[PDB]
Amino acid sequence: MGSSQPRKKIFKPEELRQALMPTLEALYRQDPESLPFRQPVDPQLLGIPDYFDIVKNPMDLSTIKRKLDTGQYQEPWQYVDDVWLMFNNAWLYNRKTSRVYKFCSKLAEVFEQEIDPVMQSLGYCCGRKYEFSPQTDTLDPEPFVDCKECGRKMHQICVLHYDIIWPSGFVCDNCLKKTGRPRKENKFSAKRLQTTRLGNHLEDRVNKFLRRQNHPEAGEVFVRVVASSDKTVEVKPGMKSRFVDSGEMSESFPYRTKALFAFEEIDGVDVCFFGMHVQEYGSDCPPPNTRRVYISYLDSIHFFRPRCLCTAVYHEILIGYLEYVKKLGYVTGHIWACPPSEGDDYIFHCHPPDQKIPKPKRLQEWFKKMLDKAFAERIINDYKDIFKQANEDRLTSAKELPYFEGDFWPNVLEESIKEKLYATMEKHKEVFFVIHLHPPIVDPDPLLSCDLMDGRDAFLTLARDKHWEFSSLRRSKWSTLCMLVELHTQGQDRFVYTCNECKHHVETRWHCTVCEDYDLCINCHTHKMVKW
Ligand SMILES: CC(C)(COP(=O)(O)OP(=O)(O)OC[C@H]1O[C@@H](n2cnc3c(N)ncnc32)[C@H](O)[C@@H]1OP(=O)(O)O)[C@@H](O)C(=O)NCCC(=O)NCCS
Ligand SMILES: [Zn+2]
Ligand SMILES: [Zn+2]
Ligand SMILES: [Zn+2]
Ligand SMILES: [Zn+2]
């Protein structure tokens, strides 16, 4: 196994100890919590013959101090890997309630507190030992990268490096201004996703909502429609043999589905904090589904800054969505406000351990004050739950109720043919909403084919495989980084560009610095234009 890197950062024993040991000391100073840790665990004093079958690499403060004093640590990470072995062996063996389990956790908050600054002035990211959350005995570790010039290993996720964005390799931040060089731009930003009129309207609406509230920690929001697709929902076999064999409802029903996410700039980087999937049923779609939209799935990560503005802006996206489709020509909208089943993640792969899933009535109340704000806003002009709507509209037939993809009702009907049914309605009135908004519908936005976002399953599976967890602010940033690379670079659309005055095909063109998608010929406008 041949190796090389020539201007390595190597640490000689006592420069390490001069930096590292103040941290060991802070552990030792913790009294009594330190005491079961100043010595190697001795199962014959303690009375635990199982120990060495359980913890197969014992570690303790004294061993660490010996390695430090004698110089057996070449790089600081070996140091910090060794104390976390100490902690991890304790949390393993001992019961979550035992005393030394508790001792241990206190040494660890102390060590976290002390280790990060020193590892940082030694030019590393943190002093932590990170493993991804358990999958379907053992856990996967966070990735590292090596500065091409230091050689000093850093958490990939900490320093947010990805070779696709910077193919020349990773180089650290201090060596970078040693280089006189700043880091090249991450072109694969939320802002730089193709923009759409739908995405713009939601984007434009909320950020000067935020402007009106004007809290200092808030950053820019970007709303992007990352997929758009023409599908049709087939009538499930029972109801179709009973109704379209008859000729009373159509076999298929066309709809356009859109997936659209919302990003905020946090610490200088895009964080994805909201995502949604709609089904839009146009004006050519036969009854019962003509001119209506349906909010399939809605999902969220709580790292929007500030949290007090957080919920309001979710509402601003939703209400802004209905505002948009209204004017296009839609007339009614439909929310199935059903809260998650089973730690079911709707769109984002590993939610924060401490962002709790709501009970259904929380979620209904939520959606209800959602709609009240828009009613007051003169956006929606009325809304009711499904029975004040259904029996107020006098419906007696199963053909009369909108029939959506993946929706509850197609499948309550579908198995109800062998076996009563207005009652199966009456139970669940509070979970389904009917939104009254009020000349063919035509969508200005082009179709975006993105297989990763066609339906919610592709993004989730890819995230499981790539460990793009949304479970911490630092992981969401990294998961957002790579989500954005997937959208930018493995979308399915090729672009043919055309001149905005003559409609002609173009290769060379003069790109406005001004308009969001504008490109004049050479056969030539008001604005400064560059050649693209
Ligand atoms: C719907 C959603 C986007 C709205 O998020 P939100 O605006 O942050 O509000 P929530 O309904 O989560 O809860 C708001 C408050 O209630 C608390 N809370 C939420 N669920 C709770 C529960 N079941 N029990 C107790 N408290 C709860 C939260 O802590 C928060 O209060 P706080 O800041 O004082 O701590 C969010 O619930 C979400 O991401 N859901 C994912 C799955 C889901 O519910 N999908 C529904 C699609 S129809
Ligand atoms: Zn780190
Ligand atoms: Zn470096
Ligand atoms: Zn212009
Ligand atoms: Zn021209």
Side-chain angles (χ1 to χ4, degrees), residues 2-532:
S3 324
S4 155
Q5 79 213 290
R7 253 310 206 183
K8 253 299 203 62
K9 186 78 220 78
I10 188 90
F11 292 100
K12 30 208 164 273
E14 82 312 329
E15 44 180 11
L16 277 192
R17 317 174 52 254
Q18 208 88 350
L20 288 185
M21 200 143 248
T23 69
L24 205 43
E25 280 175 355
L27 302 192
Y28 264 96
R29 294 182 312 97
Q30 300 315 293
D31 204 311
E33 296 100 339
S34 190
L35 280 73
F37 299 92
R38 304 182 187 186
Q39 334 69 47
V41 167
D42 188 332
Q44 284 258 316
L45 298 199
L46 278 299
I48 49 188
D50 58 333
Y51 187 79
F52 291 151
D53 319 330
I54 295 285
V55 163
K56 302 176 114 65
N57 292 115
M59 186 62 47
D60 55 285
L61 300 154
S62 80
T63 289
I64 298 151
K65 179 158 186 332
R66 174 161 46 238
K67 288 184 158 182
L68 220 49
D69 289 352
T70 46
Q72 274 161 64
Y73 287 145
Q74 311 150 263
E75 188 215 24
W77 280 110
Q78 312 172 293
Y79 170 70
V80 317
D81 290 339
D82 265 11
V83 316
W84 284 105
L85 175 51
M86 189 175 68
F87 299 142
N88 279 332
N89 302 334
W91 290 323
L92 180 77
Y93 184 92
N94 312 273
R95 271 313 97 216
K96 290 80 52 189
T97 81
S98 61
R99 173 217 308 133
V100 59
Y101 188 104
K102 287 172 189 171
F103 283 5
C104 175
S105 317
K106 200 267 190 311
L107 303 185
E109 43 170 11
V110 165
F111 187 77
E112 293 176 341
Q113 185 192 260
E114 298 286 312
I115 190 53
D116 281 348
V118 313
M119 284 284 278
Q120 273 155 8
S121 286
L122 312 203
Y124 300 94
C125 43
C126 67
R128 320 306 193 80
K129 186 232 163 50
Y130 285 115
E131 299 164 311
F132 293 117
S133 265
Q135 248 161 3
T136 87
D137 165 88
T138 166
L139 275 66
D140 287 326
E142 266 205 25
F144 292 103
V145 279
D146 292 16
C147 170
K148 272 181 58 173
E149 318 199 344
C150 304
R152 63 184 47 154
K153 181 187 64 181
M154 294 165 92
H155 280 126
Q156 189 169 20
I157 296 204
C158 280
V159 73
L160 286 170
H161 181 84
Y162 201 10
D163 278 347
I164 313 301
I165 310 177
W166 301 277
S168 37
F170 171 70
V171 306
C172 92
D173 270 47
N174 300 148
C175 300
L176 259 170
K177 66 184 128 84
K178 255 187 53 209
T179 303
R181 174 59 158 150
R183 199 149 73 158
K184 193 32 141 203
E185 256 203 358
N186 180 7
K187 309 186 272 92
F188 302 109
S189 70
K191 187 193 197 176
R192 276 177 36 111
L193 291 177
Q194 188 190 341
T195 174
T196 45
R197 292 157 82 120
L198 166 48
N200 288 1
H201 185 221
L202 317 184
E203 170 188 89
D204 291 323
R205 196 147 155 276
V206 69
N207 36 20
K208 61 146 149 173
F209 161 91
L210 293 128
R211 276 177 259 179
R212 278 198 312 89
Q213 317 245 344
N214 239 37
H215 175 303
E217 295 272 280
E220 186 167 344
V221 173
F222 315 93
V223 181
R224 287 294 177 288
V225 177
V226 316
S228 204
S229 174
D230 282 335
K231 306 180 188 313
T232 73
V233 46
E234 268 193 56
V235 174
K236 297 254 187 304
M239 197 159 157
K240 79 103 163 192
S241 154
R242 297 258 315 122
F243 276 75
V244 61
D245 294 37
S246 147
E248 283 166 280
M249 60 179 20
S250 321
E251 238 175 287
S252 301
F253 291 92
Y255 60 114
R256 168 166 304 170
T257 176
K258 299 175 173 170
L260 66 91
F261 293 85
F263 313 81
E264 195 194 10
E265 172 275 332
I266 299 178
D267 300 336
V269 55
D270 297 333
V271 178
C272 199
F273 65 87
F274 173 84
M276 165 171 75
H277 285 257
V278 303
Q279 303 166 29
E280 313 186 314
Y281 292 80
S283 45
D284 285 52
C285 191
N289 283 12
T290 310
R291 303 183 110 99
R292 31 202 68 172
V293 295
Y294 171 71
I295 306 297
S296 210
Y297 284 91
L298 203 142
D299 200 7
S300 177
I301 310 293
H302 66 44
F303 298 115
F304 182 88
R305 276 202 205 144
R307 312 152 293 121
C308 66
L309 285 182
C310 155
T311 283
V313 313
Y314 299 171
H315 290 192
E316 286 291 305
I317 306 165
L318 294 171
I319 61 198
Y321 176 68
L322 305 101
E323 184 171 355
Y324 179 78
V325 306
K326 215 174 126 165
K327 64 150 269 149
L328 281 186
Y330 292 81
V331 79
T332 87
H334 309 308
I335 298 188
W336 176 16
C338 176
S341 67
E342 188 218 1
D344 211 66
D345 297 320
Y346 278 168
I347 297 165
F348 300 97
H349 152 57
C350 183
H351 283 65
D354 77 294
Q355 184 198 247
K356 208 187 102 211
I357 305 312
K359 304 113 96 178
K361 189 200 288 233
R362 317 205 59 123
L363 188 61
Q364 303 156 10
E365 271 156 35
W366 188 82
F367 275 111
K368 297 195 202 132
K369 198 69 52 143
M370 203 293 287
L371 288 162
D372 288 342
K373 219 250 193 200
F375 195 153
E377 171 89 9
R378 218 64 57 82
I379 284 305
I380 179 189
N381 283 157
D382 197 293
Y383 80 83
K384 299 134 197 142
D385 41 72
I386 36 177
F387 309 144
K388 194 190 319 157
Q389 200 46 57
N391 299 335
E392 187 162 82
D393 301 317
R394 306 224 178 253
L395 290 308
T396 72
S397 202
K399 78 169 81 164
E400 300 148 339
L401 277 194
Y403 192 105
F404 294 139
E405 243 303 335
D407 186 51
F408 183 47
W409 300 103
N411 273 129
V412 47
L413 301 182
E414 192 42 40
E415 213 75 328
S416 152
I417 45 160
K418 210 277 166 273
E419 161 260 312
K420 178 112 167 70
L421 259 62
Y422 262 81
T424 41
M425 264 184 110
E426 311 311 327
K427 193 193 314 190
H428 306 99
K429 178 200 97 202
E430 306 94 341
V431 51
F432 301 96
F433 297 174
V434 170
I435 298 184
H436 296 288
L437 286 79
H438 294 277
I441 308 155
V442 286
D443 184 352
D445 283 329
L447 294 171
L448 296 76
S449 151
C450 170
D451 295 312
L452 177 64
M453 301 290 180
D454 188 53
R456 67 193 234 256
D457 308 284
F459 182 48
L460 281 188
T461 298
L462 178 53
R464 317 281 181 65
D465 313 341
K466 313 293 281 251
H467 279 305
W468 298 340
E469 303 188 6
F470 293 85
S471 55
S472 71
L473 174 60
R474 74 191 267 289
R475 291 196 174 149
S476 35
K477 287 172 174 159
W478 168 261
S479 315
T480 302
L481 191 89
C482 318
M483 180 207 338
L484 283 159
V485 158
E486 215 70 28
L487 306 173
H488 274 282
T489 80
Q490 315 242 22
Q492 272 65 29
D493 270 333
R494 274 314 80 61
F495 298 134
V496 164
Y497 306 61
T498 36
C499 171
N500 302 58
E501 166 79 290
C502 61
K503 178 233 89 183
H504 282 127
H505 268 124
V506 305
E507 294 289 15
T508 312
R509 56 177 184 302
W510 289 73
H511 204 70
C512 66
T513 324
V514 57
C515 328
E516 72 148 2
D517 185 43
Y518 180 108
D519 255 341
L520 297 195
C521 60
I522 298 180
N523 301 342
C524 80
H525 194 48
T526 302
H527 316 152
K528 278 113 168 172
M529 322 171 308
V530 301
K531 194 168 204 184
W532 257 30

PDB file of all heavy atoms in Angstrom, residues 512-515 518 525 527 529, ligand 4:
ATOM      1  N   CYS A 512     -29.503  38.939 -21.168  1.00  0.00           N
ATOM      2  CA  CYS A 512     -29.813  40.000 -20.225  1.00  0.00           C
ATOM      3  C   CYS A 512     -29.178  39.752 -18.863  1.00  0.00           C
ATOM      4  O   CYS A 512     -29.107  38.609 -18.371  1.00  0.00           O
ATOM      5  CB  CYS A 512     -31.340  40.055 -20.050  1.00  0.00           C
ATOM      6  SG  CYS A 512     -31.987  38.567 -19.271  1.00  0.00           S
ATOM      7  N   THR A 513     -28.725  40.832 -18.232  1.00  0.00           N
ATOM      8  CA  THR A 513     -28.408  40.789 -16.795  1.00  0.00           C
ATOM      9  C   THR A 513     -29.625  41.108 -15.920  1.00  0.00           C
ATOM     10  O   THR A 513     -29.528  41.094 -14.694  1.00  0.00           O
ATOM     11  CB  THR A 513     -27.262  41.765 -16.451  1.00  0.00           C
ATOM     12  OG1 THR A 513     -26.310  41.812 -17.526  1.00  0.00           O
ATOM     13  CG2 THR A 513     -26.544  41.321 -15.176  1.00  0.00           C
ATOM     14  N   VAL A 514     -30.778  41.336 -16.531  1.00  0.00           N
ATOM     15  CA  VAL A 514     -31.934  42.039 -15.989  1.00  0.00           C
ATOM     16  C   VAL A 514     -33.152  41.134 -15.811  1.00  0.00           C
ATOM     17  O   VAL A 514     -33.593  40.914 -14.677  1.00  0.00           O
ATOM     18  CB  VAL A 514     -32.202  43.256 -16.895  1.00  0.00           C
ATOM     19  CG1 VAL A 514     -32.399  42.743 -18.308  1.00  0.00           C
ATOM     20  CG2 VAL A 514     -33.461  43.991 -16.474  1.00  0.00           C
ATOM     21  N   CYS A 515     -33.685  40.624 -16.920  1.00  0.00           N
ATOM     22  CA  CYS A 515     -34.881  39.801 -16.891  1.00  0.00           C
ATOM     23  C   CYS A 515     -34.531  38.367 -16.464  1.00  0.00           C
ATOM     24  O   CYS A 515     -33.390  37.917 -16.585  1.00  0.00           O
ATOM     25  CB  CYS A 515     -35.553  39.769 -18.263  1.00  0.00           C
ATOM     26  SG  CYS A 515     -35.348  41.309 -19.195  1.00  0.00           S
ATOM     27  N   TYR A 518     -34.376  35.879 -20.569  1.00  0.00           N
ATOM     28  CA  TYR A 518     -34.453  36.819 -21.685  1.00  0.00           C
ATOM     29  C   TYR A 518     -33.203  36.688 -22.538  1.00  0.00           C
ATOM     30  O   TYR A 518     -32.096  36.746 -22.008  1.00  0.00           O
ATOM     31  CB  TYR A 518     -34.584  38.259 -21.166  1.00  0.00           C
ATOM     32  CG  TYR A 518     -34.665  39.305 -22.245  1.00  0.00           C
ATOM     33  CD1 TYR A 518     -35.857  39.951 -22.509  1.00  0.00           C
ATOM     34  CD2 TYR A 518     -33.550  39.638 -23.004  1.00  0.00           C
ATOM     35  CE1 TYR A 518     -35.941  40.882 -23.487  1.00  0.00           C
ATOM     36  CE2 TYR A 518     -33.631  40.564 -23.989  1.00  0.00           C
ATOM     37  CZ  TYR A 518     -34.835  41.184 -24.223  1.00  0.00           C
ATOM     38  OH  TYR A 518     -34.938  42.117 -25.212  1.00  0.00           O
ATOM     39  N   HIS A 525     -32.668  46.089 -27.991  1.00  0.00           N
ATOM     40  CA  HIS A 525     -33.001  45.966 -26.578  1.00  0.00           C
ATOM     41  C   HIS A 525     -32.309  46.926 -25.639  1.00  0.00           C
ATOM     42  O   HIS A 525     -31.152  47.304 -25.829  1.00  0.00           O
ATOM     43  CB  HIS A 525     -32.708  44.570 -26.053  1.00  0.00           C
ATOM     44  CG  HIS A 525     -33.329  44.288 -24.723  1.00  0.00           C
ATOM     45  ND1 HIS A 525     -34.648  44.559 -24.445  1.00  0.00           N
ATOM     46  CD2 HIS A 525     -32.813  43.759 -23.594  1.00  0.00           C
ATOM     47  CE1 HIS A 525     -34.916  44.211 -23.201  1.00  0.00           C
ATOM     48  NE2 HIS A 525     -33.822  43.710 -22.666  1.00  0.00           N
ATOM     49  N   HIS A 527     -31.267  46.713 -22.403  1.00  0.00           N
ATOM     50  CA  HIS A 527     -30.466  46.402 -21.225  1.00  0.00           C
ATOM     51  C   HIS A 527     -29.036  45.991 -21.566  1.00  0.00           C
ATOM     52  O   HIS A 527     -28.713  45.639 -22.704  1.00  0.00           O
ATOM     53  CB  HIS A 527     -31.146  45.301 -20.417  1.00  0.00           C
ATOM     54  CG  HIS A 527     -32.622  45.503 -20.259  1.00  0.00           C
ATOM     55  ND1 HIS A 527     -33.511  44.463 -20.098  1.00  0.00           N
ATOM     56  CD2 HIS A 527     -33.367  46.633 -20.236  1.00  0.00           C
ATOM     57  CE1 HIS A 527     -34.736  44.939 -19.985  1.00  0.00           C
ATOM     58  NE2 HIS A 527     -34.678  46.254 -20.073  1.00  0.00           N
ATOM     59  N   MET A 529     -26.333  43.554 -21.958  1.00  0.00           N
ATOM     60  CA  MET A 529     -26.394  42.133 -22.243  1.00  0.00           C
ATOM     61  C   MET A 529     -25.006  41.562 -22.486  1.00  0.00           C
ATOM     62  O   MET A 529     -24.137  42.203 -23.087  1.00  0.00           O
ATOM     63  CB  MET A 529     -27.299  41.832 -23.422  1.00  0.00           C
ATOM     64  CG  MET A 529     -28.515  42.681 -23.465  1.00  0.00           C
ATOM     65  SD  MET A 529     -29.323  42.407 -25.030  1.00  0.00           S
ATOM     66  CE  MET A 529     -27.968  42.682 -26.179  1.00  0.00           C
TER      67      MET A 529
HETATM   68 ZN    ZN B   4     -33.407  42.554 -20.366  1.00  0.00          ZN
END
